[PDB]
Amino acid sequence: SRRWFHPNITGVEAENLLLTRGVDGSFLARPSKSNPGDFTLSVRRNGAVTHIKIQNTGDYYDLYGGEKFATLAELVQYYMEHHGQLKENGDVIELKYPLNCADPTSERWFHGHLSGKEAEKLLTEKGKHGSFLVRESQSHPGDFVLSVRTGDDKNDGKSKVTHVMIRCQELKYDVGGGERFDSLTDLVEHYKKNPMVETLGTVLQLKQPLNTTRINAAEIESRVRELSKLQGFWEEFETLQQQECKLLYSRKEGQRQENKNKNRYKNILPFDHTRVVLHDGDPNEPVSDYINANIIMPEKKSYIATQGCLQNTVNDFWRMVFQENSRVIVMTTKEVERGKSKCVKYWPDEYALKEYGVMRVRNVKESAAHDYTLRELKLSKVGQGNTERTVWQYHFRTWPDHGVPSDPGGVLDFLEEVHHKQESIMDAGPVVVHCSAGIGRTGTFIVIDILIDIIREKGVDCDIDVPKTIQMVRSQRSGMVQTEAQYRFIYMAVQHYIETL
Ligand SMILES: Cc1nc(N2CCC3(CC2)CO[C@@H](C)[C@H]3N)c(CO)nc1-c1cccc(Cl)c1Cl
Ligand SMILES: [Cl-]
Ligand SMILES: [Cl-]
């Protein structure tokens, strides 16, 4: 249900599409290809088309005149279910009818200009039973080919590849008989639910798109070069974004009245099924189990991804650090950037001692490095001296105000140190990573950390799959990794880490 995003459409084409193929209440979203992180929400209303700017510098989607969101799907879901909220001169703009895109570019199974010879090799060397892909036809421009692998996954002739010709006849697609579809996606979805059966009984099951993003770590440099050609990075990122509609999990607790002002941004909320639940709260507080934070479990180190504190959640943050036995905190922003508070100070001045509700914190020592400041903190519960433990706060301070670092070396040396600290502490809990809304830079640091932990343990003899890792983390907190710039930065960091092995 993300067909309303059109990756290769212009503003002219958007307007004409809404005016000729849509009605009042129709809408679509689209990127500004030249300006990264810029998107447009185009809506038809009163026979005219309004364009609404959406900006993402790396922390969240900022909708002009509206609110801030973790994903465009969560944005669209919000206004398709909360009417009268989106306003112009202040007139209400209704999102009623998604205008579905027919472009297959961002589909996981679509490989564009790929030859039949390449498609078979890939299916043979990387596929399994039910792996499939769609490519543009080499013989007849405008047509396509669906290639499917079937067989026994236990070479020896037990598996095969079957090619199915897809013709384009008067702007519709068909496999030679039966229904004619308005797009390749409709055709593929139809034959995923109703599989073609070959003469003699082979069921051409479309089980999963061919995995082409999982590569050996030594292949990363070549992949980055391919993805960098003028850009394969953009197509792969928007293919990942297309799948964000699978991740609209419930966030009911963060929407409760008692919890609304515990959120930095009211619509950027933790999934219920992975949120950190706080116990032992004040019995006189009706709802005391809430913080805008999620456990991120790789699927040996786990993380808590959370926002920068508010004045009224500092105490809850320390309750969380204590309860989860966290010993390492990563801050991803300065306290203040561009004159705006990005991470309120929740620790004492150096050598000072403060109580934060029932928790007591001493700042033992601060140490300055080039890219970050280390603060050695001692955390304990008031009245229970034997509960004291040291919490090492790594405050990354040189991330640019917009975009990403030009070189990943600083981030990598930082994560390397954080990793060694965590590993030195027996039975340490999850590493807390936070600031801002806790999804952009936070997701980027966490995904880099997960990937380099693989390489650190296994060296060059391991498979890396960047979008699979990101999708896995985004299923535990909304919108982890916000921008294509961060996406490329993750690749560049992995590549750099491998080179310095
Ligand atoms: C992001 C991604 N990209 C893939 N590629 C690369 C980009 C193309 C399609 C195939 C190739 O050509 C482009 C025009 C484009 N259509 C594949 C295939 O394995 N998977 C994923 C993936 C992986 C794990 C989790 C999730 Cl959620 C996803 Cl979406
Ligand atoms: Cl596969
Ligand atoms: Cl962040």
Curated annotation (Swiss-Prot):
Belongs to the protein-tyrosine phosphatase family. Non-receptor class 2 subfamily. It is linked to LEOPARD syndrome 1: A disorder characterized by lentigines, electrocardiographic conduction abnormalities, ocular hypertelorism, pulmonic stenosis, abnormalities of genitalia, retardation of growth, and sensorineural deafness. Noonan syndrome 1: A form of Noonan syndrome, a disease characterized by short stature, facial dysmorphic features such as hypertelorism, a downward eyeslant and low-set posteriorly rotated ears, and a high incidence of congenital heart defects and hypertrophic cardiomyopathy. Other features can include a short neck with webbing or redundancy of skin, deafness, motor delay, variable intellectual deficits, multiple skeletal defects, cryptorchidism, and bleeding diathesis. Changing residue 69 to K: In acute myeloid leukemia; requires 2 nucleotide substitutions. One of its GO terms (biological process) is negative regulation of type I interferon production. It is an enzyme of class 3 (hydrolase). Changing residue 74 to K: In JMML; increases protein tyrosine phosphatase activity against CDC73. The active site is at residue 435. Pfam families: SH2, Y_phosphatase. The SH2 domains repress phosphatase activity. Binding of these domains to phosphotyrosine-containing proteins relieves this auto-inhibition, possibly by inducing a conformational change in the enzyme. Changing residue 467 to S: In NS1; increased phosphatase activity. Its EC number is 3.1.3.48. PROSITE patterns: SH2 (PS50001), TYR_PHOSPHATASE_1 (PS00383), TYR_PHOSPHATASE_2 (PS50056), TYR_PHOSPHATASE_PTP (PS50055). This is Tyrosine-protein phosphatase non-receptor type 11. It comes from Homo sapiens (Human). Widely expressed, with highest levels in heart, brain, and skeletal muscle. Residues 233-493 form the Tyrosine-protein phosphatase domain.
